[PDB]
Scaffold this motif. Structure first.
Motif, PDB file in Angstrom:
ATOM      1  N   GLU A   1       0.769  -1.247   0.000  1.00  0.00           N
ATOM      2  CA  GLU A   1       0.000   0.000   0.000  1.00  0.00           C
ATOM      3  C   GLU A   1       0.804   1.303   0.000  1.00  0.00           C
ATOM      4  O   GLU A   1       0.408   2.266  -0.653  1.00  0.00           O
ATOM      5  N   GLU A   2       1.923   1.340   0.719  1.00  0.00           N
ATOM      6  CA  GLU A   2       2.733   2.555   0.765  1.00  0.00           C
ATOM      7  C   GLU A   2       3.468   2.867  -0.543  1.00  0.00           C
ATOM      8  O   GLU A   2       3.419   4.003  -1.022  1.00  0.00           O
ATOM      9  N   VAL A   3       4.159   1.870  -1.104  1.00  0.00           N
ATOM     10  CA  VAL A   3       4.906   2.050  -2.350  1.00  0.00           C
ATOM     11  C   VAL A   3       3.972   2.557  -3.445  1.00  0.00           C
ATOM     12  O   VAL A   3       4.320   3.453  -4.212  1.00  0.00           O
ATOM     13  N   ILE A   4       2.788   1.961  -3.524  1.00  0.00           N
ATOM     14  CA  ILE A   4       1.813   2.336  -4.533  1.00  0.00           C
ATOM     15  C   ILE A   4       0.931   3.501  -4.078  1.00  0.00           C
ATOM     16  O   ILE A   4       0.729   4.457  -4.825  1.00  0.00           O
ATOM     17  N   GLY A   5       0.461   3.458  -2.834  1.00  0.00           N
ATOM     18  CA  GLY A   5      -0.401   4.524  -2.356  1.00  0.00           C
ATOM     19  C   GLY A   5      -1.848   4.197  -2.676  1.00  0.00           C
ATOM     20  O   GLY A   5      -2.678   5.078  -2.868  1.00  0.00           O
ATOM     21  N   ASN A   6      -2.105   2.902  -2.809  1.00  0.00           N
ATOM     22  CA  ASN A   6      -3.420   2.333  -3.094  1.00  0.00           C
ATOM     23  C   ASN A   6      -3.334   0.967  -2.456  1.00  0.00           C
ATOM     24  O   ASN A   6      -2.238   0.427  -2.305  1.00  0.00           O
ATOM     25  N   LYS A   7      -4.475   0.395  -2.099  1.00  0.00           N
ATOM     26  CA  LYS A   7      -4.490  -0.921  -1.470  1.00  0.00           C
ATOM     27  C   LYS A   7      -5.195  -1.915  -2.377  1.00  0.00           C
ATOM     28  O   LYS A   7      -6.373  -1.739  -2.682  1.00  0.00           O
ATOM     29  N   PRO A   8      -4.480  -2.967  -2.830  1.00  0.00           N
ATOM     30  CA  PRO A   8      -5.053  -3.992  -3.710  1.00  0.00           C
ATOM     31  C   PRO A   8      -5.999  -4.881  -2.930  1.00  0.00           C
ATOM     32  O   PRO A   8      -5.897  -4.982  -1.707  1.00  0.00           O
ATOM     33  N   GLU A   9      -6.916  -5.529  -3.639  1.00  0.00           N
ATOM     34  CA  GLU A   9      -7.888  -6.391  -2.980  1.00  0.00           C
ATOM     35  C   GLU A   9      -7.431  -7.824  -2.737  1.00  0.00           C
ATOM     36  O   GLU A   9      -8.140  -8.600  -2.111  1.00  0.00           O
ATOM     37  N   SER A  10      -6.246  -8.171  -3.222  1.00  0.00           N
ATOM     38  CA  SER A  10      -5.717  -9.515  -3.041  1.00  0.00           C
ATOM     39  C   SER A  10      -4.209  -9.396  -2.984  1.00  0.00           C
ATOM     40  O   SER A  10      -3.668  -8.304  -3.159  1.00  0.00           O
TER      41      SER A  10
ATOM     42  N   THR B   1       1.327  -7.997 -10.185  1.00  0.00           N
ATOM     43  CA  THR B   1       0.142  -8.708 -10.656  1.00  0.00           C
ATOM     44  C   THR B   1      -0.474  -9.482  -9.498  1.00  0.00           C
ATOM     45  O   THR B   1       0.147  -9.626  -8.455  1.00  0.00           O
ATOM     46  N   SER B   2      -1.690  -9.986  -9.674  1.00  0.00           N
ATOM     47  CA  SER B   2      -2.294 -10.806  -8.628  1.00  0.00           C
ATOM     48  C   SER B   2      -1.487 -12.120  -8.613  1.00  0.00           C
ATOM     49  O   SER B   2      -0.582 -12.298  -9.438  1.00  0.00           O
ATOM     50  N   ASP B   3      -1.817 -13.044  -7.710  1.00  0.00           N
ATOM     51  CA  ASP B   3      -1.072 -14.300  -7.602  1.00  0.00           C
ATOM     52  C   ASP B   3      -1.351 -15.296  -8.720  1.00  0.00           C
ATOM     53  O   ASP B   3      -2.371 -15.211  -9.403  1.00  0.00           O
ATOM     54  N   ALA B   4      -0.427 -16.236  -8.899  1.00  0.00           N
ATOM     55  CA  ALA B   4      -0.559 -17.278  -9.908  1.00  0.00           C
ATOM     56  C   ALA B   4      -1.785 -18.117  -9.550  1.00  0.00           C
ATOM     57  O   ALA B   4      -2.102 -18.297  -8.379  1.00  0.00           O
TER      58      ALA B   4
END
Length: 83
Positions: A29-38, A58-61
């Protein structure tokens, strides 16, 4: 690979993915400044003609859904592109 292809499409360059490291949403979240859902995998790469570190998230395999692309220059300054 299926990942190189993602970088090629968004940036025009062809690189070889180095390593894939998993991260929780709160951690990235900090590096991007957004929080992914997975959880997201960070695929590192390096452009030698431009001295840039490339990080494809990317999301996980096996899904590998593109989320963001981070580019760090000679000056250690980032530029983020939401996918």
């Amino acid at each position: 690979t299926n990942l190189s292809d993602i970088i090629e499409k968004e940036t025009g360059k062809q690189l070889v993915i180095q390593e894939s490291i998993l991260m929780l949403p709160e951690e990235v979240e900090e590096v991007i400044g957004n929080k992914p859902e997975s959880d997201i995998l960070v695929h590192t790469a390096y452009d030698e003609s431009t001295d840039e570190n490339v990080m494809l998230l990317t999301s996980d395999a096996p899904e590998y859904k593109p989320w963001a692309l981070v580019i760090q220059d000679s000056n250690g300054e980032n530029k983020i592109k939401m996918l």
